[PDB]
Amino acid sequence: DKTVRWCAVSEHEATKCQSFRDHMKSVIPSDGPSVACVKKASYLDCIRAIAANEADAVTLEAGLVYDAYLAPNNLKPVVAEFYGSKEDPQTFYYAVAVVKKDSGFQMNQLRGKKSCHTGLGRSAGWNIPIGLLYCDLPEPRKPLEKAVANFFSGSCAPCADGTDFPQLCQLCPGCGCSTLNQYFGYSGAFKCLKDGAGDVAFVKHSTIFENLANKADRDQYELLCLDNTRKPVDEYKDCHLAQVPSHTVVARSMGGKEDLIWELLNQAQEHFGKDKSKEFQLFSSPHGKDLLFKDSAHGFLKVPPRMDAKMYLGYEYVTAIRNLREGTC
Ligand SMILES: [Fe+3]
C-alpha cells in the first residue's frame, strides 16, 4: 500500500514522526501502509513540498487550509480530525480568549493590551479574534498585520514577518513558525499568557485544561465573552468568540495519495488512537503538544470525495476569512 511522505514541522514533530514510522512498521505488515518523514521549518514549506511532489501530507490548521487551496498549490483536505469523543465526534471546536482573573478589562477594552496568538492565519489565534476586532483597529487598517501591531501594545504572532511588523514579535522575538518558538500554537500562546508576557491568549476551549490539571490553578483564569463580561474557563460554551472547523490533513489534487493517506490514518487510529497503545500515541507525545495532530483530537474522519477547501470549511467560515482581507467600517 505504498508509502506516505508525511511533512513534519521542526524537530519535535520530526521526532514524533520517526516514532510514528517505527511503531507503524512493528504493527502493520510489509503489505500495509508505511510512513516516511520530511522535515521542514514551517507549514509553508510543507505546502510547497506537497505541491512539488516531494511530500504527500500534512495536517493544516483550518484557517490555513483556505490559503493552501489557492494556486499554485491547490491542495485539498482529505482527512479531518474530530474532537470530543468517539461516541459523539465533533468536527468543530471553540475559539476562546483566555485572560487572568482580576486583570480588569473586557473584550471592548483590548486596545493597548498585549496579545498572544497561536499563529498568523490560524482560526482561533487569528482569523476569529482579529475578524471581530477589525473596526477597533486604527486606520489605515491595511496591511492588517501593522494595524494589529498598532492596536495592541506588544504581541506574539508566530509566522508573521518580524522585520516589517516588529511589535507582532515583541512577546516572542522572531515570531518563529514552529514549536521551536515556545509561544507557538495553542499551548504556546497560553504559556505566553501564563508567563506574564501577554494579557490575553487567543486559543481553543481545551487549551487551559491541557496545561493546568488542577481546577484551583484554572480558577485564576477567565474568558472574555462577546457581551463584554467574563466567565469561568469551564463555561466556554456560553462564552466563546466562535465555532470553527476541525484541522485537516491536506494533499495534492493530482496523484495525491488521499486513498493511502486515509488507509494509513484509519489503521493508525485503531493501533495508536486514544487509549489504544502503551508504545505509541497519535494524539499526545512525550516530546510536545499538538505535534502532527492536535492533542485534543480523538480520531479521524474521511473528507467526502473531491471536496475542496471552500466547501469543506463552509460558507460561514469562508465569508469570515474573505471579509478579513476586505473589510469596511
Ligand atoms: Fe486551530
UniProtKB/Swiss-Prot annotation:
Effect annotated for changing G256S: In allele TF*C3; associated with a reduction in total iron binding capacity; risk factor for iron deficiency anemia in menstruating white women
- The chain positions of domain Transferrin-like read 4-326
Found, by tissue, as follows: Expressed by the liver and secreted in plasma.
- Disulfide-bonded cysteine pairs: these are C7-C46, C17-C37, C116-C192, C135-C329, C156-C172, C159-C177, C169-C175, C225-C239
Q: Which domain of life is it from?
A: Eukaryota
Quote the subcellular location field of this record.
Answer: Secreted
Q: Which residues bind Fe(3+) 1?
A: E61, Y93, Y186, H247
Q: How does it assemble?
A: Monomer. Part of a complex composed of SLC40A1/ferroportin, TF/transferrin and HEPH/hephaestin that transfers iron from cells to transferrin.
**What role does it play?**
Transferrins are iron binding transport proteins which can bind two Fe(3+) ions in association with the binding of an anion, usually bicarbonate. It is responsible for the transport of iron from sites of absorption and heme degradation to those of storage and utilization. Serum transferrin may also have a further role in stimulating cell proliferation.
Protein name, please? Answer: Serotransferrin
Please state the gene responsible for encoding this protein.
Answer: TF
The shown chain, on whole-protein numbering, covers 22 to 350 of 698
